[PDB]
Design a protein around this ligand. Structure first.
Ligand code: CDL
Ligand code: UQ
Ligand code: PLX
Ligand code: PLX
Ligand code: PLX
Ligand code: PEE
Ligand code: PEE
Ligand code: PEE
Ligand code: PEE
Ligand code: DCQ
Ligand code: SF4
Lengths: 105, 115, 98, 70, 71, 175, 83, 318, 156
């Protein structure tokens, strides 16, 4: 089914391309390099069954970095509250959030 | 942003030229005038009938040889790598098989059109 | 997810349904196969660009190469079928039953 | 021719002169007169954006020298 | 110098967003101001939406498609 | 929010997919696939994939030219069908259009799990990275890595191409 | 000796295009392995600083690492100036 | 202000095409011991205006058997793509500065063939169908060789940016390094623009008018303008690729003048070639491209990959 | 009036454009077509007047009936005449095309091409010289110069 010729011969036929934290050209990092690094080092050598349970926090962080669902939910909630507050006139946006900011280098 | 404006301007100019050509002159269309042309006479059959392609085999090979271009176009960027020996070996290896594929179809009469 | 991801996924689904539902011409189904490949290319490229995974920037090119191989195979089979029957209709391919 | 072909060639050359000269003049007119900046990579775009931010008039080509460091 | 200025600009934008979020989300009963969505306590590179969420559309265009559209 | 350009491009992508999936005459199918390839090239360009989008556009242009030649050779009829010349083709086209409309509406006006998961929209600009460095294109570097990192991929791809040439010649032999 | 000579004469008489193509391809295949400047090309590729050189934390046991760019330690590109 | 630049690009190109028609007529006349147009205006300078006004005041006709949408779309696509091909050309500055200008031009050129194909098919006439199939054959003949020639030539440039070609040729023309590739590229551009001896799609002696036989009036004129604009654009691209003009950043008009004379010389070379030779058979064109051009192109691609490594002359800007 | 002046000037422009760009169909029948070729020859060089042969009837402005029109050929000539977009002109060249000529009493010859299509200019001769055909073409140009379509429309 899976004859690990690569591991027996130490060839690295396709293992250079399996993960995002593995030796990219010019040392260009992946957008979620640290989260995947943490999750891989948490789950290494303990087996797939345990990796799912004792490393669920790192995987949740990695998935949040990948898809950013919770961040978008928080931003949507904040903007909905902001729109609700302006429509009744209780809140006014600051000048630096309306295009009249003082830029810095 | 600029490229979309340029494309829109070009397409708009062409469409406006078509509109001017189609609405400015006087039109007198009748059946004899709008009929299909075959130099003096009515066509025997339809122009939608199957039209045999004698170069059908070269057309299939063009599909495979066109993707050779996709694999070879990043070559200018590949020449900037440190392991130049590996890149040169693989670049020369890829073209050699492309040359051998052409040689195989040539020697097996694949480039000659159907009779 | 972005809504563009849903758009590309529905493009794949529509092309798959178009392949699975057959009209008279064999050629139409090959175009649906090519459309599925195009949607796969677009989706994979978007995923790779978004996550900045540098090394899989070459993977869609391999996808395109094997897409060309598939298209050549399908066109060759269509050539033989049309040479046999003079038409690329699927209903002529009924010599073999279950 | 034979020199009567020349007027048409000259008209065509005059027509072909216009695009590049107009492009250069428009670039100079809309970039402070100094050859519109080229940003083929993200670092050049970052330089352009910083130049726009520190100009004070939201224009990258407005250049601040040593007179802006009091 | 560019790295130092980038750090300061990003931190200032995050602080301004935090203050505006504190003002806006006061009426929500169970909302923690500046609450992270990650279990880890290490620094996370801010997402584009987080920096420019409460700003004008022109700035968002310039930040997202400014370089790609520049020709 | 910002100009939703990629949303329009992806909607046109889906529209072209419906166009060639309702399966009119292969001429119009190829036209729809060309439109889809162009708008997909534009989509990929809008996220920074200039090379990949342009390359897929070029490849599909060549493929569709070959497909047009083959359609004229072996897929013609006396009256080629368009999207309005047949009840079945028109029904499929309208059904695809309204299915896409329903999905889009249910997607942006509320949050539902269509098939896989849900989403709210917010435009594509939110998920970007605002990374600021480099005298190169990361897409170009990753693609050029094929000749230094992907030796195995180059080997299998070249073998597959040569075998494909041999295969088409074997199939089209006849006898 | 003479068989290959006659074969090459016939090929030059009938298919000069293929003869030239094979000669150019063979030269392109074999010449790079005998060139002394291939290593120079590799070194030139290595000498291009695409990314920032991250400094090392000094621990008092690196005699071959400079403390300033103009210090004599580290790689030198003098060979490149005269190339 | 950018729309001003778009117009200052497109309108003079149309004027140049209009007067290129007259230049062709006069040059082919004088190579044939006659004069060509010299009555409509002094030295025939008013002939293109009369031709355009006659063509756009003449009745256009829809064939009864034609497919109307594609029939109308094809000339629009042709003219719009012909105009679009000019935007990345650096003269010395481009209207649109692209990282990949050469490959963009490749893709747009590949798309341009569909105007011919769709016009021929939608005309629903036998001669137009023959012309469209000949166009399919021509593209199959030239595309791969042209692309690999571009690859081999640009290997010495270091990127696909068109403006870098000026820097690459600061001291010498690229032709002095790749003249076999230059000859093959010249023949490939002759085939790509459907010009004699490869003017197979129109095929006037054999197919009467070929793909555009059904077309009349204004729509016909747009096909003509698209073809001539493509000729000028291809010659300008060849001039940029193989004949590098020295550019002074403080005086770009010198580069503009040098560029214009070189592209005019290349266009006149096309005109001369048309005046000199008979027409190929359209199977002979494919045999020429696949049995002679393709092997040399592959060998020279190998050679131009190996040469910068052997001589330590790899260009910058990965 | 102002409108009368405007339509007169527009007529002048359109007539100049049409008579300065006259494209005859590539169409000949007999002996006369040889003199047509000689009128296209370098000595006379009709292209210098703006006269270019075009094969497609869709792209042609004038038909020159140069040769005998037989009964078997008349439907084809009528077909190619009809397919010509307007404005279109017909020039009859030679005795055969004018009135039947030397085969006038034949059983298989149409006694003049004006039985099939309207004719604008009749060029006499058997064959007319290339110079005579050039004179006929210039006369057709002068006749086109006298058209007043827009004046007639304005006075309607
Ligand atoms: C959402 C819905 C999608 C909207 C479709 C877009 C608009 C097209 C619909 C109008 C055309 C049909 C009109 C007609 O039948 O006769 C006209 C009318 C009736 O003539 P008739 O003799 O009485 O009857 C003829 C028969 O009924 C039948 O005669 P027929 O044989 O000509 O019928 C065929 C026709 C009939 O159409 C239909 O069957 C239904 C229309 C649905 C077509 C949608 C299919 C999807 C195709 C791909 C997606 C394209 C984009 C769509 C998305 C919109 C956003 C941009 O189908 C077409 O050919 C339309 C093709 C449109 C694609 C053009 C794109 C150009 C490609 C260039 C390269 C691309 C680069 C990469 C990008 O005659 C005229 O008025 C003169 C011609 C006017 C046509 C103008 C040009 C065509 C429209 C431009 C296309 C839009 C480009 C942007
Ligand atoms: C062996 O015989 C033959 C020739 O030799 C005599 C030819 O020349 C020849 C070529 C055809 C010629 C008669 C040239 C015809 C000239 C064109 C059709 C006129 C095109 C000019 C306009 C359409 C261009 C637009 C006009 C504007 C003034 C340009 C600016 C545009 C505005 C928007 C500004 C052919 C086919 C031929 O067969
Ligand atoms: C070079 C690039 C730039 C070009 C710029 C110009 C672009 C021009 C585009 C093409 C339009 C001009 C064509 C010629 C003029 C238009 C004439 C015609 O198209 O319109 C007529 C429109 O007529 C309509 O069918 C009915 C007329 C009434 C319509 C009522 C619309 C609302 C009017 C309300 C009246 C009160 C005033 C409202 C306006 C302020 C229909 O003409 P028709 O006879 O078929 O065609 C024959 C053409 N001939 C006669 C010139 C040879
Ligand atoms: C056990 C039996 C062996 C023979 C039969 C095996 C059948 C399979 C075909 C060949 C086996 C594949 C083995 C080669 C795997 C490639 C990887 C390895 O060789 O290392 C490469 C060494 O490169 C070599 O040149 C590999 C190329 C040699 C193969 C090309 C020709 C042989 C293929 C023959 C079969 C293919 C089909 C038929 C074609 C004739 C790259 O190393 P390097 O670049 O240092 O460092 C990479 C790490 N970086 C990126 C961080 C720098
Ligand atoms: C700007 C874009 C939109 C407009 C598009 C059109 C572009 C402008 C048109 C260019 C006008 C030039 C034509 C003038 C050439 C006339 C040459 C002269 O010879 O004409 C003479 C007299 O002139 C003519 O009678 C009238 C010509 C001028 C027409 C009036 C001017 C109208 C201009 C209005 C412009 C409006 C355009 C449309 C705007 C929407 C008659 O002599 P002719 O018999 O030949 O020669 C005899 C041959 N020989 C010498 C060898 C013996
Ligand atoms: C790109 C190159 C060319 C650019 C395109 C613009 C060319 C501009 C040339 C303008 C010249 C003037 C056009 C005059 C010819 C119009 C068509 C024509 O001749 O129709 C005549 C017709 C005959 O009708 P009737 O006598 O009633 O019926 C007889 C049959 N029963 O009379 C008319 O309709 C006249 C109408 C006035 C024409 C309008 C001209 C106004 C100028 C518009 C130019 C557009 C520029 C863009
Ligand atoms: C049609 C085929 C579309 C191809 C367009 C290619 C244009 C192009 O290459 O410009 C690239 C340019 C910049 O790229 P760089 O080279 O990296 O330089 C800038 C970075 N500093 O990218 C852009 O500007 C992207 C702009 C948006 C893409 C345009 C999408 C066009 C798609 C066509 C759709 C047609 C309209 C919709 C309906 C079609 C049929 C009805
Ligand atoms: C002037 C009044 C404007 C009216 C517009 C009506 C258009 C129309 O459909 O009418 C058909 C009209 C005239 O025909 P008739 O009615 O028989 O004669 C009119 C004289 N009595 O025909 C036309 O001119 C059609 C012109 C096409 C319209 C332009 C829209 C087409 C868009 C093309 C998109 C494809 C782009 C391809 C390239 C882009 C890819 C990057
Ligand atoms: C080691 C180099 C390899 C890589 C470099 C090559 C890259 C590209 C070149 C290869 C492309 C494929 C070419 C395939 C050759 C097909 C041969 C063939 O069958 O053609 C014969 C004709 O060709 C032959 O004569 C058969 C082979 C003859 C020998 C060809 C060259 C062999 C090697 C010669 C040079 C060797 C190296 C150069 C050294 C020069 C001496 C100093 C049939 O001709 P038709 O076109 O069908 O005839 C129609 C009209 N009668
Ligand atoms: C381009 C050179 C000028 C060609 C002029 C067009 C000739 C049209 C007459 C047709 C014709 C041709 C072509 C012709 O070749 C010929 O001789 C057999 C005739 O017999 C008189 C003809 O009638
Ligand atoms: S008129 Fe005289 S020259 Fe002309 S075709 Fe008749 S017989 Fe021949």
């Amino acid at each position: 089914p899976f004859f690990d010729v690569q591991k027996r011969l130490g060839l690295d036929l396709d293992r250079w391309m399996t993960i995002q934290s593995a030796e990219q050209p010019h040392k260009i990092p992946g957008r979620c390099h640290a989260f995947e690094k943490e999750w891989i080092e948490c789950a290494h050598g303990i087996g797939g069954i345990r990796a799912e349970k004792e490393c669920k926090i790192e995987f949740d962080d990695f998935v949040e970095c990948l898809l950013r669902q919770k961040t978008m939910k928080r931003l949507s909630a904040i903007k909905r509250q902001r729109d609700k507050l302006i429509k009744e006139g209780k809140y006014t946006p600051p000048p630096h959030h309306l295009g009249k900011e003082d830029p810095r280098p | 942003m600029n490229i979309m404006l340029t494309l829109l301007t070009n397409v708009t100019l062409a469409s406006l030229l078509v509109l001017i050509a189609f609405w400015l002159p006087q039109l007198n269309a009748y059946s004899e005038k709008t009929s299909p042309y075959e130099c003096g006479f009515d066509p025997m059959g339809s122009a939608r009938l199957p039209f045999s392609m004698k170069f059908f085999l070269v057309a299939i090979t063009f599909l495979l040889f066109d993707l050779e271009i996709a694999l070879l176009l990043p070559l200018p960027w590949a020449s900037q790598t440190n392991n130049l020996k590996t890149m040169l070996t693989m670049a020369l290896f890829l073209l050699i098989l492309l040359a051998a594929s052409l040689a195989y179809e040539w020697t097996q009469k694949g480039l000659e059109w159907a009779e | 997810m972005p809504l563009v991801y849903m758009n590309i996924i529905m493009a794949f689904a529509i092309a798959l349904a178009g392949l699975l539902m057959y009209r008279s011409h064999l050629m139409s189904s090959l175009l649906c196969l090519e459309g599925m490949m195009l949607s796969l290319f677009i989706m994979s490229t978007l995923i790779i660009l978004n996550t900045h995974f540098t090394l899989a920037n070459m993977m869609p090119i391999i996808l395109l190469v094997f897409a060309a191989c598939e298209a050549a195979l399908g066109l060759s089979l269509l050539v033989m079928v049309s040479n046999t029957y003079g038409t690329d209709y699927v209903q002529n391919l009924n010599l073999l039953q279950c | 021719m034979w020199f009567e072909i020349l007027p048409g060639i000259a008209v065509m050359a005059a027509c072909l002169f216009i695009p590049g000269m107009a492009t250069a003049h428009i670039h100079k007119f809309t970039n402070g007169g100094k050859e519109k900046r080229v940003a083929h990579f993200s670092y050049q775009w970052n330089l352009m954006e910083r130049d726009r931010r520190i100009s004070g008039v939201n224009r990258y080509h407005v250049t601040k020298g040593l007179e802006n460091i009091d | 110098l560019f790295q130092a200025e980038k750090d300061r600009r990003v931190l200032q934008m995050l602080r301004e967003n935090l203050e505006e979020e504190a003002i806006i989300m006061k009426d929500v009963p169970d909302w923690k101001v500046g609450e992270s969505v990650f279990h880890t306590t290490r620094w996370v590179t801010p997402m584009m939406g987080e920096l420019y969420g409460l700003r004008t559309n022109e700035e968002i265009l310039s930040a997202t498609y400014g370089f790609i559209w520049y020709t | 929010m910002t100009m939703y350009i990629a949303f329009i491009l992806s909607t046109i992508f889906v529209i072209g997919f419906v166009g060639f999936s309702s399966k009119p005459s292969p001429i119009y199918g190829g036209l729809g696939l060309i439109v889809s390839g162009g708008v997909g090239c534009g989509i990929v360009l809008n996220f920074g994939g200039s090379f990949l989008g342009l390359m897929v556009f070029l490849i599909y242009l060549g493929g569709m030219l070959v497909v047009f030649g083959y359609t004229t050779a072996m897929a013609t009829e006396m009256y080629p069908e368009v999207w309005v010349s047949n009840k079945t083709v028109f029904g499929a086209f309208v059904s695809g259009l309204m299915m896409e409309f329903c999905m889009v509406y249910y997607a942006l006006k509320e949050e539902e799990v269509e098939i896989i998961f849900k989403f709210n929209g917010l435009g594509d600009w939110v998920i970007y990275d605002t990374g600021d460095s480099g005298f190169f294109s990361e897409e170009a570097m990753g693609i050029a890595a094929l000749y230094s990192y992907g030796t195995w991929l180059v080997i299998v791809t070249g073998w597959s191409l040569l075998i494909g040439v041999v295969v088409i010649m074997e199939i089209t032999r006849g006898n | 000796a003479g068989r290959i000579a006659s074969f090459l004469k016939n090929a030059w008489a009938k298919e000069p295009v293929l003869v030239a193509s094979f000669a150019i391809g063979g030269l392109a295949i074999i010449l790079p392995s005998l060139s002394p400047y291939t290593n120079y090309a590799i070194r030139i590729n290595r000498a291009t600083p695409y990314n920032y050189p991250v400094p090392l934390r000094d621990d008092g046991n690196m005699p071959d690492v400079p403390s300033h760019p103009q210090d004599p330690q580290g790689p030198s590109l003098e060979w490149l100036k005269n190339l | 202000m950018f729309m001003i630049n778009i117009l200052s690009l497109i309108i003079p190109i149309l004027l140049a095409v209009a007067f290129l028609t007259l230049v062709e007529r006069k040059v082919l006349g004088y190579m044939q011991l006659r004069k060509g147009p010299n009555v409509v205006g002094p030295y025939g300078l008013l002939q293109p205006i009369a031709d355009a006004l006659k063509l756009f005041t003449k009745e256009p006709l829809r064939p009864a058997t034609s497919s109307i949408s594609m029939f109308i779309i094809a000339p629009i696509l042709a003219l719009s793509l012909a105009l679009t091909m000019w935007v990345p050309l650096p003269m010395p500055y481009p209207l649109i500065n692209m990282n990949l200008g050469v490959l963009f031009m490749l893709a747009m050129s590949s798309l341009a063939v569909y105007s011919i194909l769709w016009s021929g098919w939608a005309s629903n006439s036998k001669y137009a169908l023959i012309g469209a199939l000949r166009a399919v054959a021509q593209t199959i003949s030239y595309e791969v060789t042209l692309a690999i020639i571009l690859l081999s030539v640009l290997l010495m440039n270091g990127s696909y940016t068109l403006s870098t070609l000026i820097t690459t040729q600061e001291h010498i023309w690229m032709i002095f390094t790749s003249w076999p590739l230059a000859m093959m590229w010249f023949i490939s551009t002759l085939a790509e623009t459907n010009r004699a001896p490869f003017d197979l799609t129109e095929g006037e002696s054999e197919l009467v008018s070929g793909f555009n036989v059904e077309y009349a009036a204004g729509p016909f004129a747009m096909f003509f303008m698209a073809e001539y604009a493509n000729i000028i654009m291809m010659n300008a691209f060849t001039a940029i690729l193989f004949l590098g003009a020295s550019h002074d950043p403080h005086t770009p008009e010198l580069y503009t003048i040098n560029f214009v004379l070189k592209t005019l010389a290349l266009t006149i070379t096309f005109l001369w070639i048309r005046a000199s030779y008979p027409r190929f058979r359209y199977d002979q064109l494919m045999h020429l491209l696949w049995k002679s051009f393709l092997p040399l192109t592959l060998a020279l691609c190998m050679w131009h990959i190996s040469l910068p490594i052997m001589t330590a002359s790899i260009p910058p800007q990965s | 009036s102002r409108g009368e002046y405007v339509v007169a000037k527009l007529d002048d422009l359109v007539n100049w454009a049409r008579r300065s760009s006259l494209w005859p169909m590539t169409f000949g029948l007999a002996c006369c077509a040889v003199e047509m070729m000689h009128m296209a020859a370098p000595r006379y060089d009709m292209d210098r007047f703006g006269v270019v042969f075009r094969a497609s009837p869709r792209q042609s402005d004038v038909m020159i009936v140069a040769g005998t029109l037989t009964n078997k050929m008349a439907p084809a000539l009528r077909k190619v005449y009809d397919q010509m977009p307007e404005p279109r002109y017909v020039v009859s060249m030679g005795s055969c095309a004018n009135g039947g000529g030397y085969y006038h009493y034949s059983y298989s010859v149409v006694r003049g091409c004006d039985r099939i299509v309207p004719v604008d200019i009749y060029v006499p001769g058997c064959p007319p010289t290339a110079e005579a055909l050039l004179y006929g073409i210039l006369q057709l140009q002068r006749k086109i110069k006298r058209e007043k379509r827009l004046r007639i429309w304005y006075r309607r």
